[PDB]
């Protein structure tokens, strides 16, 4: 499910979060997100 980046070589970052938005999160916090996102969510009327 990996994306197709246009730029071939990865670019270094030193930007403070006011300047730009980044996706720096590892896999384990996203496993926590999957655990917290998967579990968080008639005939009697005619009778």
């Amino acid at each position: 499910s990996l994306l197709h980046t246009f730029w071939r070589l990865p670019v270094a970052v030193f930007f403070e979060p006011h300047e730009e938005n980044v996706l720096r999160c590892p896999e384990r916090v996203l496993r926590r997100l999957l655990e917290d996102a998967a579990v968080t969510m008639d005939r009697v009327r005619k009778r």
Binding site: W7, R8, L9, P10, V11, A12
Partner: protein
């Protein structure tokens, strides 16, 4: 001078015919040819050989040196540079020392053409255009 060796073809004679004349304000003036009798003078031979050498070494060593520098890349600029060079591109260290010194000596044998120091700047010309007043500059 760079069209010296391939002078035999029929298009490049018209190309150097186009290149032979210049245009200024009402000056449709043309220059003599540097090549005489289908072989270049040693002066312009050195002048063109320096350019061909610096191009052929820049297209060879800069990739290795920019990928050496890319681990200490502390700017958002050198990575675009090496990406550009990678998109173009599709031993004992004394050879590297000799190649870098050859690069810089062929640069040193070139500085007669890379620039020109301003000498005079006009201030007012004479009417009928035969003399002017110029402050001298170094």
């Amino acid at each position: 001078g760079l069209f010296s060796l391939d002078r035999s073809y029929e298009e490049v004679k018209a190309a150097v015919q186009q290149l032979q004349t210049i245009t200024f304000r009402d000056a449709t003036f043309t220059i003599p040819d540097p090549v005489i009798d289908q072989h270049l003078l040693i002066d312009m031979k050195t002048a063109c050989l320096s350019m061909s050498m610096v191009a052929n070494l820049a297209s060879e060593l800069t990739m290795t040196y920019v990928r050496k520098l890319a681990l200490e890349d502390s700017s958002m600029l050198l990575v675009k540079c090496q990406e550009l060079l990678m998109r173009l591109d599709r031993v004992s260290p004394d050879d590297e020392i000799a190649r870098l010194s050859a690069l810089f000596v062929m640069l040193r044998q070139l500085d007669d053409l890379i620039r020109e120091q301003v000498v005079f700047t006009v201030c007012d010309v004479s009417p009928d255009n035969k003399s002017a007043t110029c402050i001298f500059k170094g």
